[PDB]
Ligand SMILES: CNS(=O)(=O)c1cccc(C)c1F
Ligand SMILES: [Cl-]
């Protein structure tokens with residue numbers, strides 16, 4: 001309690017000694033309130049919208065551009081038998097992830113380049129590029145760093161703003177990255193290294209990965225989402241995640257222990273309240289970390305929870321109230337004998353999972369999952385999970401996957417989602433102050449992603465070609481999974497590299513010579529997934545596409561353009 005968060009709290013009060021008021025009407029029950037002080041949207045991409053006119057009248061698209069009680073909740077302490085299961089599983093899982101990896105500190109150098117190459121670090125000097133080029137900031141970091149080496153914290157404070165992001169100042173983010181960045185930077189949750197993980201795999205790999213699991217003898221495929229995963233992270237989960245420090249040494253060990261002890265297991269947050277007074281609250285549970293460390297620790301704790309749910313379905317342990325000495329031996333023998341095989345039966349991305357268990361007893365194995373506080377979304381606490389019998393219907397990372405056979409018999413496994421969602425996201429730009437050129441380059445990034453991932457959707461291949469015809473040929477795609485669409489190289493060359501050359505599920509490496517040789521979903525399958533084909537508006541839009549292309553060209557001005565439309569059969573002369 002206050003010994004660990006006091007200094008942070010004291011520093012904030014003193015800097016607002018002319019507003020501090022211990023309001024006794026504070027809405028917090030689960031968050032400790034300490035005091036208060038006085039304080040005080042999504043834009044449309046016009047290039048994408050002008051080239052997607054039929055969607056101007058589709059509410060699912062247009063509503064996406066318009067525009068709690070979860071955070072203020074407490075998860076009960078797991079039973080003793082649950083706690084033992086979690087500790088034994090976490091210990092074994094860090095050892096497996098560590099067999100072929102070395103924990104190491106990340107560098108100012110690595111962090112500096114990251115800020116220059118742009119990446120969502122969630123930080124609060126105008127920008128962060130300037131601070132990185134200011135030795136005063138690094139002296140600030142140094143002070144905090146020596147504070148952390150002494151088991152104390154001064155400036156590592158969260159800011160609150162199914163989604164609530166916790167931003168810290170760049171300095172606090174550096175110290176987090178220094179200590180724990182290795183998890184992401186060195187690919188600890190890669191499929192090679194973790195067996196269940198998919199970190200760095202790419203959307204053109206996830207479908208093949210789900211298909212390989214399918215191959216494994218067993219029951220249905222289960223894909224239960226957790227209700228607000230970050231809010232259900234227990235202090236017991238935070239302490240099992242901290243055991244990664246047991247694989248560390250010297251300074252690094254001490255710096256990592258301090259991030260876990262001082263910023264994760266004992267948080268401090270500023271939240272704006274309109275009644276506007278900045279509220280200084282604290283708690284010892286729930287997920288609070290950078291988005292990227294959040295991803296790796298979410299993947300770890302999800303892998304642990306799913307391997308236990310698999311042990312419950314196999315009857316490795318009878319009761320979660322207490323674990324017999326014999327049951328502990330059985331759990332350990334299970335992990336040593338089949339742990340790796342059981343991790344290979346899952347695909348886990350943060351709080352998202354697909355499990356192909358040994359059989360369907362998994363569906364009603366719910367005691368350990370519920371008691372860890374990982375309560376399933378949109379189903380009764382004790383109702384058995386509904387599994388999937390077809391890998392092409394399993395939801396994962398907001399997608400499903402189709403098996404598509406090319407005219408030459410080679411097999412593509414392609415990512416897919418409702419096309420209204422794809423068009424509605426491409427029509428939105430984050431932040432404002434965008435020039436026409438910057439807006440066009442963001443439209444081109446979406447168009448190139450569509451050509452690479454969603455080429456099998458008739459409307460997206462046409463709109464992608466239209467956008468790439470409407471934006472100057474040499475303008476570079478921008479943005480504010482691996483992103484092979486972020487390039488000025490020809491998209492047919494990238495397609496061949498991604499789907500043929502570098503694709504380990506494709507034995508025959510014969511290049512594709514034109515877009516013609518790249519297939520679509522069946523017409524009915526296209527419609528089922530939101531294609532507008534068969535509609536008067538869509539056909540007029542395809543027939544008159546050169547007119548829409550010319551409207552956008554006229555707005556951008558006299559630039560060098562390419563006509564990509566003759567890459568499609570119909571638009572050839
Ligand atoms: C322009 N839309 S369309 O002419 O209706 C159409 C385009 C592509 C495929 C089909 C089956 C179709 F009906
Ligand atoms: Cl099914």
Ligand SMILES: [Zn+2]
Nearest residue numbers: 153154155156
């Ligand atoms: Zn600190």
Ligand SMILES: [Zn+2]
Nearest residue numbers: 400416417529
């Ligand atoms: Zn689909």
